[PDB]
Swiss-Prot record, chain B:
This is DNA-directed RNA polymerase subunit beta'. Co-administration of salinamide and rifampicin or salinamide and myxopyronin suppresses the emergence of resistance to both antibiotics. Belongs to the RNA polymerase beta' chain family. It comes from Escherichia coli (strain K12). The RNAP catalytic core consists of 2 alpha, 1 beta, 1 beta' and 1 omega subunit. When a sigma factor is associated with the core the holoenzyme is formed, which can initiate transcription. The rRNA transcription and antitermination complex (rrnTAC) consists of RNAP, NusA, NusB, NusE (rpsJ), NusG, SubB, ribosomal protein S4, DNA and precursor rRNA; S4 is more flexible than other subunits. The gene is rpoC. Acetylated on several lysine residues in the presence of glucose. The chain holds residues 253 to 302 of 1407 of the full protein. DNA-dependent RNA polymerase (RNAP) catalyzes the transcription of DNA into RNA using the four ribonucleoside triphosphates as substrates.
From Swiss-Prot, chain C:
InterPro entries: NGN-like_dom (IPR006645), NGN_dom_sf (IPR036735), NusG-like (IPR043425), Transcription_antiterm_RfaH (IPR010215). GO terms for cellular component: cytosol. Belongs to the RfaH family. This is Transcription antitermination protein RfaH.
Length: 50, 50, 161
RNA sequence: CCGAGAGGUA
DNA sequence: GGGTATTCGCCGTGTACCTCTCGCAGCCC
DNA sequence: GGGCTGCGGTAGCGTGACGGCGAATACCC
């Protein structure tokens, strides 16, 4: 086998749209907003803090 | 492998891998050249979808 | 008015640009003159620094987005969702003066580098640029298993590593 | 020597 | 605040064989 | 001549399956 180094990471679509989404009910997060994050029309916070 | 002629009976997987590699190479060149925000967003979006 | 982004077909930015200049739509594409081997000839072509991307400024009331989308040579607006994207005015302003660094040239050989040969009786031989003759052909220090040679060849029979 | 489309036998 | 109740989009829909044609167009690099 | 690339166009094409099922959400509290 071989490989391809992706310059940006990529959500595996089986784990995104298996219905129920494993990423979806893993993050406690609805699938619609996760696809709005992944397809680059929304931002989601990481370590909001103060 | 070719069918009987001068042309290759191409496979769909090589189309998919060729699409992924072309988009990833374009994305490496744009991250090198410091393209603006929306251009590299579209580039990572097309890479995600490919 | 506002600014939108159009991804075009591959190698039709000039044709789509001509159609949008025949229309009343102000285009923007950062052109840099890159030294590119076209067909054996090192021709400096004022090609886009970006790929098929292009910027337009219009208003949807004057000429509609469907009409811009149906322009000869245009693939699609960049959307991210339903509506086409709005680039802010800072991006248009900072892509007015740009393109600083080099004549960077992906996959065209610069002299003083290492290449490979693609045809002929020397196919498969790594070579050093000593001195290309100009913008027409090149001259190469070819390797052998005994002694290196040199040759003045066109730019189709060899390609960069 | 893989896919699509059309027809047929059981 | 959750308890239905409607909508939505995913799954699935026989076996074996035989024959035939057709399988990139455009294009501006 | 040929490397590439996905509707050809200054829009619109799609339209004659059907069931089940489970999640996502609408309405009404």
């Amino acid at each position: 086998m071989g490989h391809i180094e992706l310059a940006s990471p990529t959500a595996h679509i089986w784990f995104l749209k298996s219905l129920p989404s494993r990423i979806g009910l893993l993050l406690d997060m609805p699938l619609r907003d996760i696809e709005r994050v992944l397809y680059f029309e929304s931002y989601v916070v990481i370590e909001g803090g103060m | 492998v070719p069918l009987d002629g001068g042309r290759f009976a191409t496979s769909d997987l090589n189309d998919l891998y060729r699409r992924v590699i072309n988009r990833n190479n374009r994305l490496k060149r744009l991250l090198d050249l410091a393209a603006p925000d929306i251009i590299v967003r579209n580039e990572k979006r097309m890479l995600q979808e490919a | 008015q506002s600014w939108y982004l159009l991804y075009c077909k591959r190698g039709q930015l000039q044709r789509a640009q001509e159609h949008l200049e025949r229309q009343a739509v102000n285009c923007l594409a950062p052109m840099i003159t890159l030294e590119k081997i076209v067909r054996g000839k090192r021709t400096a072509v004022s090609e886009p620094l970006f790929p098929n991307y292009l910027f337009v400024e219009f208003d949807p009331e004057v000429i509609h987005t469907t009409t811009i989308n149906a322009t000869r040579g245009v693939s699609h607006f960049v959307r991210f969702g339903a509506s086409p994207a709005i680039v802010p005015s800072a991006v248009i302003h900072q892509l007015s003066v740009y393109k600083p660094k080099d004549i960077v040239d992906p996959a065209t050989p610069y002299p003083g580098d290492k290449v490979i040969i693609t045809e002929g009786a020397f196919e498969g031989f790594q070579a050093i640029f000593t001195e290309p003759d100009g913008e027409a052909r090149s001259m190469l220090l070819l390797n052998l298993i005994n002694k290196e040679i040199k040759h003045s060849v066109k730019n189709t029979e060899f390609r960069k590593l």
